[PDB]
RNA sequence: AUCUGUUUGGUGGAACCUGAUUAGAGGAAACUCAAAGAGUGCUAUGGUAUGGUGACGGAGUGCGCUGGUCAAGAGUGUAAAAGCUUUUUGAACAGAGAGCAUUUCCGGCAGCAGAGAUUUCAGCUGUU
RNA sequence: AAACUAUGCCGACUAGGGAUCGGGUGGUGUUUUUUUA
RNA sequence: UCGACGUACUUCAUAGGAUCAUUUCUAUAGGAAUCGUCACUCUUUGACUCUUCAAAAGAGCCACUGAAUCCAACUUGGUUGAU
């Protein structure tokens, strides 16, 4: 209905994190059917647990508002919750593991003195966690050992992390070098894929629940959608009223995209623009299904490429791409000249360029 | 189109028929042309259930023709290939499509059930249960369905546990139908007679439950009969309410008498004890009406059954004088409490009963009892 | 063709089975209807003559304005066309382009001039009377409805002497003299 | 009334002017033949198409799944409890058709006797 | 004697592309050359 | 008659927004359309026949064979009542 259940003035400062969780108190079972709970953290050094009345079910017929508060020594910057158990983790000057039924962090995790900017729990191997540091690093954790596991330092900071819902050991990173990197947990020396279409920093990334697509929000006032098997966007979404895309999410049906910009509006988008939400007759379904396979077969034809890839992007983005394309051609032309005379100048794959180093060598 | 998909499903069967040599390609073509018209008929607008019946009938003959060519040409009872069960699988599919399209037609459901029951080996009894489950949900208020699956699982299966549950559920939906009560009681005692005979059989080689159903039946049938004949509202006038009370007593009395006839069938059970429970039921005043005062005609029949109760099932050979005296002793007891008009009618009926059952069937010259019977009849 | 749906129309914008660009707007059919031309190619035969006039005028215009040759020929062409009746006025030389048209030539056909002289109620009626041999120009009967009448010859358009139409004209006014007929 | 001449209604529609139209304007007939527009009616129902290629189906067994009862364990709470949570386990019970394997039997052939209207199905014995 | 058809938004302001002049660092292999400088 | 001055008088600008124009896209993501037909009702247009205002011309002559109308004649009903 595009309407609010409730509005809370949660924090005096900035809301630096938010997650929707289903708590399990030791002695009490909350009415998950009639109430939904959300955890918020802010730079005022507190984490608050809220309760909201919902109308999903009519099996009943309150206690709507703040439930519990956690105080912290330092400011918080990112919050996420374990799916299976009630434990949740907050990222500030130190990444802390919390339990819903304890007012203090049950365990403290940290690679070093560097602060953590974001974190995201794994969706299948729920015991695994990944975090982003201000020192251009990605740290992997495992709650089964209650310790960090691996760390890689990249050329630029990564703003957000998302785990593949269908591949437990794969995650994508939103990076500040105009790129998004697809990584394998077990071998972090090399990336699986690189997405290069954006012209400003990528600020958030999200996997479709089917796992075959990702959506990236950028500081260039655009939203791009990528196929996991291709390194270039298939779509760009933009509006004159959207001012800085800071968050992007997929609806759990994979049919819609929710984007939040700094102008104060939360917009809804179709994952596929040409699709519609109505239930289709069998004749409709087959004709649309027939078209999709027919389009895939002739995608390589010149005319079909011309129309299919044509999009109207804002003028600022267009000029950025033109200037960006010229620079890369000059760099490629220039390295080609250098290789003629330079005896020892190796070939480095694009997937391995962004990695400055890894702690545990293999 | 849907038709083309269904026609292509017939192709693997037809490849088999040509391959085995039973049918020639020209003959196979003729069958498909006839099938093509039917499948188009079913998948189009204006289709009726008769189209499904026609197509099922046609497929059955094709099954027969294949069978006879199989013995004539192949000289084999069964050729282990797709052609054997392809027709049978198809006919079942036509039944499913027709039933979904036209659930209202109960005749088609019966044909579907008879067809699937007939091929017990080919179709598991589990599938038969699925058909009944879907049918019962669509028509909960048709008792003939409830008894049918009850009868089917008492005879083909003999699962009194499931059959009892069917009657339990059927009466839950249709408490106002006397017929379902009659069959459940018939099943209930049928379970008893079969049980006692097993005990009797066991010995050589080495009823209240129905009455409770009868009691709840009479209460429940009364409530619904009152709700009917009253419409949306109650009846304000007192006399009219009395009449509605009279109708249900007579309506309920006819039902009770119908059960009385049922008990006679069962020799193993103590019919006299079972009947006496019915007589005791009517002794109690019901709906503020007394049988002796308000409905004498029903009362005289109530008395008459009691008079002959001890001698109802006694054969002429085993006729005991003492038991007859008890019947006559009962006979005089009621006359002292009855009006003259009732006594005369009651006297006529009892005299006819004794004359027809005992006097007319006995030789006059051989038995001293015959003289005693005449003296009683003369004195009655 | 059935009315195209929205998605069909966008993909079939240029489809038109009844109007084509080479039709030139069906100007020929419109002019044929107005003046009841019965020969399909009469318009395009007239069109070629109009083009010949316009071609000559364009070439004449490109000669220097003070040329004696240019002024002589342009006046001669204006003199001749006015006499035929194709041009209503002789004043303006630009008329050779703007006001030289097939309708101007068609407007001098015998059926039309009969209509303007009120000899017939409609151009179609005039064509029928010509085909039925009621109309003479001078002493010659003309059954061709495409005869062009010059301004001078428009004075001699009249009915045939023994025409039944003439009798009705004179009988209506009670001025019929059977000696003449 | 060889009185009077205004009004109302019908008939008629010169001139000027204004507007619209023009291979002039119309009319009648239909179980006639065409080209289009709008609305309405009809289960108009494959979201991934029958239980089945002896490549199979039926019967049985085991595994799997479901419901609640009981017992035990863990957590929480208490002076000790009672009480609450449990994606912790086990027992028996009641099940669904809703999956997975299973060759243990049947579905070739002859005979015995039964249920139903010469044909259909069920049971038993011999045989491949 | 001179001018005589011109013209470019501006700035405290971002990232570039090709070419060129002067200097410096590195690479490489052709001109060059050899203990006279 | 023409000039200069004075007086009087006529004329001349420019904007904001939307839509339609590319056999998708007129540049904008704030917007709306992707289905192999079976019937019924209504409405518009056009043919064929005939016809009015309203007339005009007949590819023309003979022979045979049918049809329709109006009179004459006859037959039925009719002042006890036809039209
Ligand atoms: Mg404008």
Residue with tokens 């003479």: C136
What number of residues does chain A have?
362
Angle at B58 between CA B53 and CA B63, to 5 degrees: 125
Q: CA A43 to CA A36: how far, in whole Å?
A: 24
What number of residues does chain C have?
181
Distance A336 CA to E28 C1' (A): 14
The CA distances from residue B90 to A300, A354, B33, B124, B203, in Å, are 45, 63, 16, 16, 52
CA C74 to chain centre: 23
- Locate B218 and state its tokens: 């009479």
Q: List phi, psi (to 5°) of A357.
A: 175, 170
Q: CA C1 to CA C136: how far, in whole Å?
A: 49
- Locate A252 and state its tokens: 């759990």
Q: CA A213 to CA A201: how far, in whole Å?
A: 19
Distance B310 CA to F76 C1' (A): 99
Q: CA A102 to CA A121: how far, in whole Å?
A: 20
- Locate C126 and state its tokens: 């005039």
Q: CA B320 to CA A341: how far, in whole Å?
A: 137
Distance C173 CA to D4 C1' (A): 39
The CA distances from residue C84 to B31, B143, C60, C117, C148, in Å, are 84, 104, 21, 17, 8
Neighbours of chain A (3+ CB pairs under 8 A): none
d(CA B149, ligand 1 centre) in Å: 82
Distance C174 CA to D85 C1' (A): 125
Distance A326 CA to E5 C1' (A): 39
Dihedral-angle region of residue A91 (phi above 0 means left; psi in -120 to 50 means alpha; beta otherwise): beta
Helices (H), chain C: 6-11, 27-35, 42-61, 68-84, 95-98, 102-106, 110-116, 123-131, 164-172
Angle at B349 between CA B344 and CA B355, to 5 degrees: 125
Task: Quickly list DSSP for A229-258.
Answer: T-SSEEEEE--TT---EEEEEE-TTSSEEE
Q: CA A277 to CA A285: how far, in whole Å?
A: 12
Q: Closest Cα to residue B110, out of B159, B138, B148, B163?
A: B148
Are B39 and B93 in contact by the 8 Å Cβ rule? The answer is no
Provide the β-strand partners of residue A170: A184
Helix (H, G, I), strand (E, B) or coil at C75: helix
Strand nucleotide closest to residue A241 (CA to C1'): F30
Give the residue nearest to nucleotide D85 (CA to C1'): A27
Q: Which nucleotides of D are covered by protein (CB under 7 A)?
A: 22-24, 36-38, 41-47, 49-54, 56-59, 75-77, 83-87, 95, 97-98, 107-109, 120-122
Q: Provide the resolution (angstroms).
A: 3.2
Q: Report the DSSP pairing between strands A76-81 and A65-71.
A: unpaired
d(CA A227, ligand 1 centre) in Å: 44
Q: CA A84 to CA A86: how far, in whole Å?
A: 7
Question: What residues have CB less than 8 Å from A165, skipping those under 6 apart?
Answer: A123, A124, A207, A208, A209, A210, A211
Question: What residues have CB less than 8 Å from B67, skipping those under 6 apart?
Answer: none
Strand nucleotide closest to residue A341 (CA to C1'): E28
Q: CA A248 to CA A237: how far, in whole Å?
A: 12
d(CA A319, ligand 1 centre) in Å: 28
Please state whether strand E lies within 7 Å of residue A240 at its CB atom. no
Are C105 and C85 in contact by the 8 Å Cβ rule? The answer is no
Q: Which nucleotides of E are covered by protein (CB under 7 A)?
A: 15-18, 27-29
Strand nucleotide closest to residue A331 (CA to C1'): E17
Helix (H, G, I), strand (E, B) or coil at B90: helix
Distance B149 CA to D123 C1' (A): 24
Q: CA B249 to CA B235: how far, in whole Å?
A: 17
Distance C137 CA to F7 C1' (A): 70
d(CA B42, ligand 1 centre) in Å: 63
- The residues of C between 110 and 129 with beta carbon within 7 Å of nucleic strand F are 121, 125, 128-129
Strand nucleotide closest to residue B46 (CA to C1'): D42
Total Cβ atoms within 10 A of residue A116: 25
Q: Report the DSSP pairing between strands A116-121 and C157-159.
A: unpaired
- Locate B36 and state its tokens: 């093509």
Strand nucleotide closest to residue C122 (CA to C1'): D24
Strand nucleotide closest to residue B129 (CA to C1'): D97
Radius of gyration of chain B from its Cα atoms, rounded to whole angstroms: 31
- Class of residue C17 by CB neighbours under 10 A (exposed 0-12, middle 13-18, buried 19+): exposed
Distance C136 CA to D16 C1' (A): 36
d(CA A241, ligand 1 centre) in Å: 24
Total Cβ atoms within 10 A of residue A179: 24
Q: Closest Cα to residue C129, out of C41, C36, C42, C31?
A: C36
Strand nucleotide closest to residue A329 (CA to C1'): E17
- Locate B295 and state its tokens: 């409905």
Please state whether strand E lies within 7 Å of residue A9 at its CB atom. no
Q: CA A326 to CA A322: how far, in whole Å?
A: 6
H helix or E strand, kind and range, residue B168: helix B160-173
Angle at C46 between CA C43 and CA C52, to 5 degrees: 140
Distance C176 CA to D12 C1' (A): 28
Question: What residues have CB less than 8 Å from B320, skipping those under 6 apart?
Answer: B314
d(CA A322, ligand 1 centre) in Å: 32
**Dihedral (CA of A93, A95, A99, A100) sign:** positive
d(CA C9, ligand 1 centre) in Å: 29
Helix (H, G, I), strand (E, B) or coil at B161: helix
Angle at B60 between CA B59 and CA B62, to 5 degrees: 65
Task: Quickly list DSSP for B62-78.
Answer: HHHHHHHHIIIII--S-
Task: Quickly list DSSP for B215-268.
Answer: HHHHHHHHHHHHHTTSTTS---SHHHHHHHHHHHHHHHHHHHHHHHHHHHT-SS
Q: Closest Cα to residue B306, out of B285, B333, B270?
A: B333
Are A171 and A130 in contact by the 8 Å Cβ rule? The answer is yes
What number of residues does chain B have?
380
Distance C138 CA to F39 C1' (A): 69
Distance A347 CA to E29 C1' (A): 23
Distance C133 CA to F64 C1' (A): 36
Please state whether strand E lies within 7 Å of residue A146 at its CB atom. no
**Dihedral (CA of B97, B102, B108, B112) sign:** positive
Please state whether strand E lies within 7 Å of residue A327 at its CB atom. yes
Q: Report the DSSP pairing between strands A147-154 and A158-163.
A: unpaired
Strand nucleotide closest to residue B118 (CA to C1'): D121
The CA distances from residue B236 to A290, B231, B243, B246, in Å, are 71, 13, 12, 16
CA B304 to chain centre: 29
Q: CA A330 to CA A336: how far, in whole Å?
A: 10
Q: CA B21 to CA B31: how far, in whole Å?
A: 15
Strand nucleotide closest to residue B45 (CA to C1'): F38
Q: Closest Cα to residue C149, out of C135, C134, C163?
A: C135
Please state whether strand F lies within 7 Å of residue A209 at its CB atom. no
Task: Quickly list DSSP for A267-307.
Answer: EEEESSTT--SSPPPHHHHHHHHHHHHHHHHTTTSHHHHHH
d(CA A243, ligand 1 centre) in Å: 29
Strand nucleotide closest to residue A330 (CA to C1'): E17
Question: What residues have CB less than 8 Å from A15, skipping those under 6 apart?
Answer: A40, A41, A42
Distance B124 CA to F22 C1' (A): 67
Radius of gyration of chain C from its Cα atoms, rounded to whole angstroms: 23
Question: What residues have CB less than 8 Å from A272, skipping those under 6 apart?
Answer: none
d(CA B128, ligand 1 centre) in Å: 78
* DSSP state at residue A166: S
The CA distances from residue B79 to A73, B120, B333, in Å, are 84, 20, 81
- The residues of A between 239 and 278 with beta carbon within 7 Å of nucleic strand F are 239-242, 265, 267, 273-276
């Amino acid at each position: 209905t595009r309407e609010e259940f409730v509005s809370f003035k949660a924090h005096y400062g900035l809301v630096t994190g938010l997650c929707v969780t289903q708590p399990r108190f030791h002695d009490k079972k909350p009415d998950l059917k009639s109430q939904n709970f959300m955890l918020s953290c802010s730079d005022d050094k507190t984490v608050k647990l809220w309760s909201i009345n919902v109308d999903d079910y009519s099996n009943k017929n309150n206690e709507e508002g703040l439930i519990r508060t956690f105080d912290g020594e330092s400011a918080f910057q990112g919050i996420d919750s374990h799916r299976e158990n009630s434990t949740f983790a907050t990222g500030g000057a130190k990444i802390h593991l919390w339990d819903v039924n304890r007012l203090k962090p049950v365990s403290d995790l940290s690679w070093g003195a560097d602060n953590i900017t974001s974190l995201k729990f794994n969706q299948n191997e729920t015991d695994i966690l990944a975090s982003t540091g201000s020192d251009n690093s990605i740290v992997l954790y495992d709650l089964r050992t209650n310790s960090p596991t691996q760390k890689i330092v990249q050329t630029m900071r990564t703003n957000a992390i998302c785990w593949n819902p269908m591949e437990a050991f794969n995650f994508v990173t939103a990076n500040e070098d105009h790129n998004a990197y697809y990584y394998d947990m077990r071998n972090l020396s090399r990336s699986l894929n690189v997405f290069k279409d954006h012209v400003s920093a990528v600020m958030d990334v999200d996997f479709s629940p089917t796992g075959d697509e990702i959506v990236t929000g950028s500081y260039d006032k655009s939203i791009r959608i990528y196929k996991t098997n291709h390194g270039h966007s298939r779509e760009i979404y933009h509006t004159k009223r959207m001012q800085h895309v800071f968050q992007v999410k997929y609806s759990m049906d994979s049919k819609y995209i929710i984007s939040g910009s700094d102008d104060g509006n939360v917009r809804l988008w179709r994952s596929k623009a040409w699709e519609r939400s109505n239930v289709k007759t069998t004749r409709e379904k087959n004709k649309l299904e027939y078209d999709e396979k027919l389009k895939e077969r002739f995608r390589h034809m010149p005319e079909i490429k011309r129309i299919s890839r044509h999009r109207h992007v804002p003028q600022v983005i267009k000029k950025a791409q033109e200037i960006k394309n010229i620079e890369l051609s000059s760099i490629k032309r220039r390295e080609a000249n250098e290789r003629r005379t330079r005896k020892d100048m190796p070939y480095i794959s694009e997937r391995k360029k962004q990695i400055v180093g890894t702690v545990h060598k293999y | 189109s849907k038709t083309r998909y269904y026609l292509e499903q017939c192709i693997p069967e037809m490849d088999d028929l040509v391959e085995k040599g039973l049918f020639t390609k020209n003959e196979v073509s003729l069958i498909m042309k006839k099938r093509t018209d039917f499948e188009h008929r079913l998948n189009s607008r204006g289709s009726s259930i008769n189209d499904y019946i026609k197509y099922i009938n046609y497929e059955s003959n094709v099954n027969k023709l294949r069978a006879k060519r199989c013995k004539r040409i192949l000289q084999v009872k069964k050729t282990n290939s797709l052609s054997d069960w392809s027709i049978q699988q198809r006919i079942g599919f036509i039944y499913q499509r027709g039933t979904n399209k036209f659930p209202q037609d109960l005749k088609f459901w019966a044909m579907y059930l008879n067809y699937m029951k007939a091929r017990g080996n080919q179709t598991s009894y589990k599938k038969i249960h699925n058909i009944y489950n879907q049918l019962l949900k669509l028509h909960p208020t048709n008792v003939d369905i409830w008894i049918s699956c009850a009868k089917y699982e008492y005879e083909v299966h003999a699962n009194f546990k499931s059959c009892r549950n069917i009657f339990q559920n059927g009466l839950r939906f249709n408490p106002d139908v006397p017929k379902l009560w009659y069959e459940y009681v018939k099943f209930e005692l049928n379970f008893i007679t079969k049980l006692i005979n097993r005990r009797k059989v066991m010995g050589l080689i080495n009823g209240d439950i129905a009455l409770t159903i009868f009691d709840v039946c009479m209460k429940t049938l009364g409530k619904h009969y009152i709700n009917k004949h009253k419409g949306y509202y109650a009846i304000s006038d007192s006399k009219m309410n009395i009449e509605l009370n009279k109708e249900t007593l007579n309506y309920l009395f006819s039902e009770s008498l119908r059960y009385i006839k049922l008990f006679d069938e069962f020799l193993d059970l103590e019919r006299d004890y079972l009947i006496n429970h019915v007589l005791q039921f009517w002794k109690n005043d019901m709906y503020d009406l007394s049988l002796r005062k308000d409905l004498p005609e029903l009362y005289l029949k109530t008395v008459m059954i009691d008079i002959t109760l001890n001698i109802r099932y006694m054969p002429v050979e085993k006729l005991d004088i003492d038991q007859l005296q008890l019947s006559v002793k009962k006979y005089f007891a009621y006359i002292s409490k009855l009006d003259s008009a009732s006594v005369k009618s009651l006297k006529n009926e009892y005299r006819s009963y004794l004359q027809d059952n005992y006097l007319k069937k006995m030789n006059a010259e051989d038995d001293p009892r015959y003289k005693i019977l005449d003296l009683i009849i003369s004195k009655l | 063709v059935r009315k195209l749906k929205h998605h069909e129309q966008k993909l079939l914008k240029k489809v038109d089975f009844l109007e084509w660009k080479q039709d030139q707007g069906h100007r020929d059919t419109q002019v044929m209807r107005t003046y009841h031309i019965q020969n399909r190619e009469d318009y395009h035969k007239y069109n070629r003559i109009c083009g010949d006039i316009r071609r000559l005028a364009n070439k004449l215009s490109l000669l220097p304005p003070t040329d004696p040759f240019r002024r002589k020929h342009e006046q001669l062409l204006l003199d001749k066309l006015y006499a035929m009746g194709v041009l209503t006025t002789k004043s303006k030389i630009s008329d050779l382009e703007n006001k030289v048209t097939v309708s101007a030539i068609c407007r001098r056909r015998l059926p039309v001039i009969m209509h303007r002289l009120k000899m017939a109620e409609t151009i179609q009626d005039a064509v029928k009377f010509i085909e039925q041999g009621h109309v003479r120009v001078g002493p010659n009967l003309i059954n061709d409805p495409a005869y062009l009448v010059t301004r001078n010859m428009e004075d001699y358009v009249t009915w045939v002497d023994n025409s039944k139409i003439k009798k009705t004209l004179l009988r209506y006014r009670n001025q019929i003299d059977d000696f003449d007929f």
